Amino acid sequence: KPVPWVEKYRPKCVDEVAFQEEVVAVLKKSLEGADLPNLLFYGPPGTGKTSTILAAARELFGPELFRLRVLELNASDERGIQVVREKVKNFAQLTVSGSRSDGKPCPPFKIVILDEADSMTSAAQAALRRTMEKESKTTRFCLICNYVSRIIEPLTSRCSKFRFKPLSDKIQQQRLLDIAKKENVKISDEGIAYLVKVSEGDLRKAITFLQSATRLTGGKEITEKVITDIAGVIPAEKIDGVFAACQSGSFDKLEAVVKDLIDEGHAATQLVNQLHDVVVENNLSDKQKSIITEKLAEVDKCLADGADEHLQLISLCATVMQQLSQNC
Amino acid sequence: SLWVDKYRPCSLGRLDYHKEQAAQLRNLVQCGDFPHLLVYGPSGAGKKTRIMCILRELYGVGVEKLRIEHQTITTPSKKKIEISTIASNYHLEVNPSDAGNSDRVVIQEMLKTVAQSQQLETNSQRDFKVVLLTEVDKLTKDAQHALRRTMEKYMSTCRLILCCNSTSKVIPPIRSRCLAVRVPAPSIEDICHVLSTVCKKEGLNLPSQLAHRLAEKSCRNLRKALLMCEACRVQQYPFTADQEIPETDWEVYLRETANAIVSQQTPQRLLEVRGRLYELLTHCIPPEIIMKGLLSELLHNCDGQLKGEVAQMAAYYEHRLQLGSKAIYHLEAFVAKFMALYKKFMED
Amino acid sequence: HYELPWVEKYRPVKLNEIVGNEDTVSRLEVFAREGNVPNIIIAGPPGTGKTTSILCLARALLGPALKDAMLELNASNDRGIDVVRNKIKMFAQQKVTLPKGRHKIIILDEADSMTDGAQQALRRTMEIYSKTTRFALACNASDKIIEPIQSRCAVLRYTKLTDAQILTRLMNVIEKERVPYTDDGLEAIIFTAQGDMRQALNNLQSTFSGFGFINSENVFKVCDEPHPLLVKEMIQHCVNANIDEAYKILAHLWHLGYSPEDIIGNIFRVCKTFQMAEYLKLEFIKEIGYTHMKIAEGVNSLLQMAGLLARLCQKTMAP
Amino acid sequence: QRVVHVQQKDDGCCLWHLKPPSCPLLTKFKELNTKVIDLSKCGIALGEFSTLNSKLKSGNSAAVFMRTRKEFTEEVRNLLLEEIRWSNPEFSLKKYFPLLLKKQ
Amino acid sequence: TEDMLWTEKYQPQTASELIGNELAIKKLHSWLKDWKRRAELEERQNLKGKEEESRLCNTVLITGPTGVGKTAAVYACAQELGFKIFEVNASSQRSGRQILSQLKEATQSHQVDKQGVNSQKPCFFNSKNATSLILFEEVDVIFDEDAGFLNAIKTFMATTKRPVILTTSDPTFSLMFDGCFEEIKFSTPSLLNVASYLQMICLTENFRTDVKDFVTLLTANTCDIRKSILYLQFWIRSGGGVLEERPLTLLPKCDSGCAETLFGLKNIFSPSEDLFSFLKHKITMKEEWHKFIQLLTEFQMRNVDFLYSNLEFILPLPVDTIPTTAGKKCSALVSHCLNSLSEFMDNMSFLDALLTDVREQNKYGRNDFSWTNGKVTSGLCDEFSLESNDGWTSQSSGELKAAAEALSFTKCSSAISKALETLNSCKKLGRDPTNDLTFYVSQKRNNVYFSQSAANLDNAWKRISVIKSVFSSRSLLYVGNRQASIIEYLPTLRNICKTEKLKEQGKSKRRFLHYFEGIHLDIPKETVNTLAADFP
């Protein structure tokens, strides 16, 4: 019966989406003309794209007509595009009636929200182009992605493109503090700041981690430890230990540090992420940074294929140790 | 049953270690908004014990009343695959990676069915039925996308607990929808305390030195430490301070394999190690574990600067082993290339 | 009133007019002469001679009783579970007077298109009605035919036709049509038909219908594939590590609009017969196969083909 | 329906207004002539892209069997039975072969 | 002048004529003999007038692999014991109403004609006394038009008075079917028994054949007896393979060369050509390269690696069956040979991992050597797959893998041969490195011409069976993890069984044998003895 706070606390109406000025303006002037063109929202995750398109849907439609006359699909379906083509064809052929008691009639078209549209290959995008140019008047599409360049030219030409910029950390901390005051959980400003930092500008992940920490802690204060282990983030002490083992030049203590990291349940992709963030923002030479980052990309690709954490981490740490001891 | 299956805790207050984590898991179910869990960590850390504790705290005691069902599912290529499922009156448990590349298939229909089961069954106890997906880290990308779709579709009617050992293969879309439960391995003192607690219930008094040896030689594996304690109880009635811990049979087989690799570097010895790795693979030992043990004992017998090259070679051929359908080819590729490198290294 | 294609005008009517697969065609010949053919399944690539040999064997076995003793079913027919249960079993129980050693024949062409349920329902029909009826199936992928059906049939593997056999049949067709030709054109036609005699005859007839002269300009205008001379020059430039000229050829092919699969197939076909050292050919085929795996997996672009060309140049520049 | 592109410009980032680079590598652009050889000028010989040869074999194939397998005599038949029994010492040859002889 | 297939020409008319599965044949024959005795006693009771201890269940079920002889054994036993088989195939419409209303009275009523030619066993379709006996053939094949067929055969369980025999090839059918029936398992017969059987049927046709070629054919088609019989009929009646006289005592010619015809290698090779001589000799000609690529492509369509599976024999290296300038030239030969072998194995790993396979492996089950895969059954419906497939990739990837494998093998073989001709100098020096260059092969891979797998699949299946039977006991049946089970529970179980066997062999107390009963483990004693032997 309760709903997650991501769904509960998204803005109900357009112009309640903060830090988006021009996108809200064109969506307002589309609401005034009551005609929604083909939309393409691109920006970082957790920046208000789904919130903005859903707010436009709820304010163009009725509260009871909003969920019936829109269809949110995920474009990364593993059964090709033809299954998604079947859903769009069925939803375009299926028609429902609409009547609002507020005195404004419903628009004749319908809204199809295709999320992660950038994950579709160019053949699938060209296949979808036929559907959207064959159901142009009776169906309008909104493609939600993060990279406009992944969307092919026939799609991006006929869509209206909007870019969503991420909120600053002060605004995210303010919204999280408002959420915590609304939901009655004891948490200082430092924990909220660490939550916003550990989410890396992702307000969706920040709200998810805050709600999960409130559920886990059982009415106590939200410490830094629960936020750290609820985000899967390795503490900086282990990262410094990894770098000290690499700089020492002893492979046995390198194996000990890696096996200690494996025994603590920490992921290897997270360690590769932290190691990359440490390496690319320090005083290493350009050759050292280049070799280390190339090995980091190779190890990340190998881990994505399903390779064992221990062997890939040992190989990457051997490469980093050799590159750091090359100056010795 | 054994002490790994009889003295296993069933309540969340009976978990000896991770008391703060067990308390947080106890207050997790009190809100009533129990989400999908992602319980990950090393092997035998206490993962499945904690899932059974949470399942007992969620429903009644009837989750312990277990049975086994078999389901036949039709693939879209018009073929039928039969899989096994641990089940009770309130929960489900399946290893979906048992269907190969068709895991997505047993991912979809099975949860669809259990959703309909919760649509049919009414008991006014809990709104959802929890299904335990074992080895989610062995699922393919299509399987994990189908899992994302199924969790987003049937969230209201059923809940999911993903038990894995590696979240690296688990896609970031899955990790962004389930609460992460990291269960690190118990320490040496924790394993010794649990071993003494279990051994006291049998009327036996093991010493602290034997418990410390069992904790050290188990590599922070509580299940392996308890089972080695079972083997020591089988071997002798009194627990001497110098009691020999029985080593694993395939582990000493892999040790002998690596000494065979190091001792002679010839095509005949390469074919002998070929036969040894075939006989290891016929025992259903996973090739990742074989590669890890082989690499560990080769790094035992390696030099200082050769350790990094051998480790990078082993990681390379383990990734190729995960890529290829016949893991034996990449195993012998690693063995032959290591033999060539070793023969080159000892020649000067 | 129209010109019949040379695939039908010059279709074999006997079992000695079939080139290639000498052992299996000879075994079918001795079975057609002697009689008592078992239930056979013929598997091979398209254009090999499977339907032709099955029809010629059935003709030689039956003779005048073809119209009543033969039941032929393609993929255009129904061939369902109910069709197997009524029509197949009714023809199998049907009385047909035949000379001793000769049976009624049920030909099931394109057995890959048969559903698994129909093949399961045809299992016992292949067994009980074996004193009056025999089954001759033709298929491309033998793995689409279920194992219980394959257990009741002798499976005969047809392989791709060697280019000498295609050349002999091509000169037989040329000398029976007075078509002017060149050896250049014959090599071009044989290259375009990768062990497919139907494709070779279609290409020859289309070339004569278009221009009337058989040379590589007319042949590769008719077929419109990536020309093997351009691919040969590109591979030669990769051998000399001339990445600029090789990419010039590759970008010319890309701007001509050829698909990456077609380009990589032509590259592999030319490099298979290319004149180079054994080790260099091995590294070339390794990189071609890795790039083709990437093309099949979904990533196909000019960047991938340029990376393949750079890898081929690196194979020459590195010992 | 009319399309539009909305990019919320921030003048303080200084990446919106980007000028062409002044380094000589990105200033001097190499030219590819896009000139290729004509394709009907060289020609293809026999066996260039296939395994074709000028010489074709004759008489080495198309050998019709026409075999007349003579009936095996009794002594040769028991000799071959003893050979198979030596090959498989645990098989019951004497209780199967007369029954298959009756079956023929 | 013959119109009969060799399966039904050489059909076993007696239960002693079948090959293998003697325990299952004896069980079925005893069950049918008990049913015949019950029928004759019923007739005697009728003549006179005018059951936990017996435990004679009304229905047997027979399961096994395809072509092993379930139907043949049923027909032979029913012919020997005078039964009359009423057969229900999947080849006729068998829905519940029709099968009940048209074959219940065969069980429930007497035979109107009990003497004569009624020993002939008919079928069922709807577009000395002989006892009736129903045979449901291929019960796993269920269609939608066979509506209520399972309920109908359940009614046949309940209300029969004459025996019912079920034939199936689905290994998991006996799990989902609810009812009481005697279960009979047909195992795959041994290689040598079926090989001698085929040699017998060939010697009846006045042909001499060797055991090794028949063993290769039988291990190629996995001991499918009917498939080997039919291919033998095709190959013998078409004139045999190759004229080669083999004088052996242990006189007509021998006819070795059937396995190469079965795989279709004779459509590529000349009759004078031999596959082993073709692979052993150095290839230079373009036509020879075409033949090698075609051969390897024909083997890659089956997803079988021909060269690596037979690596020892095809290599130019010595092969044995299992029972200082001189120093620099002794070491350099072995080092170069190991370098070339490592290069070839790296090439094969490259082809396995980074090159596409034409058949997508681990499609319905997981990878090989796993007891968790389950059972994969073929389709039971009349609907097509209707999924996107790429035919060009399957056409081109086989040739790509074949060409790359052929080039890798030729490079490796040339490198090892150009290492090997200099072994004469080492032999003249008095030092023999050939004991290090040799290859030790098993007898299982030496009694066949060529192998499709380099591992012991029988040992693998035995290990799979013992792993299944360990973790099917009711105490271990609820273990959540599976590979962790066989990596942690199973070695400790093997050590416990070894210690228990050592205690038993030391003449200790017999209560230590009840240790598994003391903890109430339900592992069968044969499995306890199997775990207590060793870890090979």
Ligand SMILES: Nc1ncnc2c1ncn2[C@@H]1O[C@H](COP(=O)(O)OP(=O)(O)OP(O)(O)=S)[C@@H](O)[C@H]1O
């Ligand atoms: N500018 C904004 N104004 C108001 N709420 C915002 C804004 N940006 C983010 N949020 C909140 O951040 C949360 C997540 O944003 P959503 O729009 O729902 O998801 P998202 O931005 O599409 O990210 P995805 O779907 O993973 S790409 C919601 O609770 C929103 O209310």
Ligand SMILES: Nc1ncnc2c1ncn2[C@@H]1O[C@H](COP(=O)(O)OP(=O)(O)OP(O)(O)=S)[C@@H](O)[C@H]1O
């Ligand atoms: N071996 C051959 N010898 C002579 N002509 C052939 C041969 N194979 C094919 N042809 C010619 O190609 C035409 C079509 O070939 P078919 O045998 O009918 O096709 P197919 O061999 O059955 O292959 P598929 O799988 O059905 S496309 C025939 O009518 C002949 O003209």
Ligand SMILES: Nc1ncnc2c1ncn2[C@@H]1O[C@H](COP(=O)(O)OP(=O)(O)OP(O)(O)=S)[C@@H](O)[C@H]1O
């Ligand atoms: N063990 C055997 N001994 C002798 N002949 C056999 C044997 N097994 C099979 N055959 C022959 O193969 C023919 C067909 O075998 P079947 O018994 O029909 O196979 P099956 O066991 O019924 O498996 P199915 O029905 O194909 S799944 C018989 O008529 C025999 O000629």
Ligand SMILES: Nc1ncnc2c1ncn2[C@@H]1O[C@H](COP(=O)(O)OP(=O)(O)O)[C@@H](O)[C@H]1O
């Ligand atoms: N807190 C605890 N107190 C006592 N015994 C425990 C505790 N946690 C785990 N165990 C024992 O250790 C074993 C843990 O194995 P399990 O958690 O199933 O392995 P995995 O973590 O790989 O799923 C169980 O058999 C249980 O008996």
Ligand SMILES: [Mg+2]
């Ligand atoms: Mg969204």
Ligand SMILES: [Mg+2]
């Ligand atoms: Mg055809």
Ligand SMILES: [Mg+2]
């Ligand atoms: Mg049968």
